[PDB]
Design a protein around this ligand. Sequence first.
Ligand SMILES: Cc1c[nH]nc1[C@H]1CCCN(c2ccc3ncnc(N)c3n2)C1
Ligand SMILES: Cc1c[nH]nc1[C@H]1CCCN(c2ccc3ncnc(N)c3n2)C1
Ligand SMILES: [Mg+2]
Ligand SMILES: [Mg+2]
Lengths: 282, 265
Amino acid sequence: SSLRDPAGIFELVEVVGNGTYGQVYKGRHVKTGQLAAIKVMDVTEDEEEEIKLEINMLKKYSHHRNIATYYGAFIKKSPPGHDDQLWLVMEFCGAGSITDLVKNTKGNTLKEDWIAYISREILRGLAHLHIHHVIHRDIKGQNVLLTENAEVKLVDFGTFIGTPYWMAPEVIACDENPDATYDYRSDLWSCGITAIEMAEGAPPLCDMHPMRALFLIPRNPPPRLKSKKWSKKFFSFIEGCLVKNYMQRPSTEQLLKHPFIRDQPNERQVRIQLKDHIDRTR
Amino acid sequence: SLRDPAGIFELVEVVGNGTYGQVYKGRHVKTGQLAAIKVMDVTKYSHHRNIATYYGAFIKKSPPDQLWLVMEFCGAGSITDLVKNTKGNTLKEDWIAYISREILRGLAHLHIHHVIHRDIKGQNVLLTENAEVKLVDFGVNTFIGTPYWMAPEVIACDENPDATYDYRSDLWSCGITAIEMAEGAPPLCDMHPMRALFLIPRNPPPRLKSKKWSKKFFSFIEGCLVKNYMQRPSTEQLLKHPFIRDQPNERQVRIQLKDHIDRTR
Ligand SMILES: Cc1c[nH]nc1[C@H]1CCCN(c2ccc3ncnc(N)c3n2)C1
Ligand SMILES: Cc1c[nH]nc1[C@H]1CCCN(c2ccc3ncnc(N)c3n2)C1
Ligand SMILES: [Mg+2]
Ligand SMILES: [Mg+2]
């Protein structure tokens, strides 16, 4: 029901990461100076329970380690009648997004063993949500963040359409498919699109008008990596993420036992190389 | 070249609270005059009385740049807010006629100069302190935006594999915008945007929910919302629609609005 005021517990600093996420802030735990991400929602009485929802979502399902964890929520009263402001507070991921990571890499491409590592983490996080019957619904490079520590965490899980390039065929509505059937395997598609984003600096169809991409995704065969340089194992993993008909798309668990994710011998060095890459740019 | 906006304009705040994005309310540091300032990280059509006038640009460098685009400031806020702030989420019928006419007047100007607004909706239709209606955000990206004011030809779909923008798409949006004024929401608002993108091309033309509206109003809606854009009238043709053409109470209307602008302010 009623919560608490943030004043003297948390503070904005503020504003991430260019408004791209909306009303989200770099914030700080006043007592310890620990950073944290902060969502600020203007509230009413019509929203009321959608809010009550957003919270139980995070509190329940944020406790894995591949998911940015819930911190707590706060009510920051506004002048009577006016709109109050809700403070959704979570773990802070200081090393930016995968989108950013690839952006900042010469030739905008990640090493295979990096892609393996990051994919696995995404899959571990997704596995956790799926086992709780939550569909993420918006896996793309931007919703996948690094910690200072090279830990991987998912955000923004559970009026605009926004960007379509990471969308699975089954979630775009058309005559064949008038009700857009989000299934848990939709996430896995987006995971495959994200791996390509890491491999190539951008999703398939990036060069197209988004309206056009939205039209094409359901009709094209599975996207493929442009280059032949990649390992068979990786070609195979992409092909698994991007089975056109989600009915035949492997489960999260099935993909976690995919050799490309499973057999990561050099992950030791990868986590190291990653931290280093972060710190330099840091 | 392009001045630095320091000493000339101060960003007072983000307008519509993020709604329009990185667009602020600025104030001239010396003169006090207000403007809208669209801020962009980077690498002669507005001087019609129904198009918010463009004041010019400033340059703020540099990497690790930001471009400033300055434009007249519209005090009374969007007509989306106006409807919101109107008891019963409905504007008065002759309020809608006057506003629609002003929309068409701006569009005509745009169209005569071969420009497609591309994004008519209650939010891109703004009011000055003095009850003047003015258009913003005309025909300037990775995000499919909000679908509800979108004309059918603009949506890529099974028989429209290549979306068509056409000056006539604006008139469809004008029609939806009038419904918004009537009911506070465009049709299918209750729908998930993805679902709405699917139905706009498929469904018959949307309609007012209420039977209380005048014949002329139903007709003007009907006129704007011709599904096939090839068979949809011009801006100029619609200006001649009785609903737009015959406004006796224009005077009372302007009055009634200026007032509201202050009252509900
Ligand atoms: C903050 C919040 C509270 N409830 N839901 C959220 C989401 C909003 C969408 C972006 N998500 C980010 C975006 C940027 C970020 N940057 C750093 N750390 C984060 N956790 C972070 N999270 C968090
Ligand atoms: C500022 C700008 C520069 N180039 N294009 C614009 C548009 C961005 C979309 C919103 N548009 C608004 C929104 C709210 C507003 N509020 C008051 N006055 C305005 N002119 C105004 N304009 C203006
Ligand atoms: Mg966790
Ligand atoms: Mg003007």
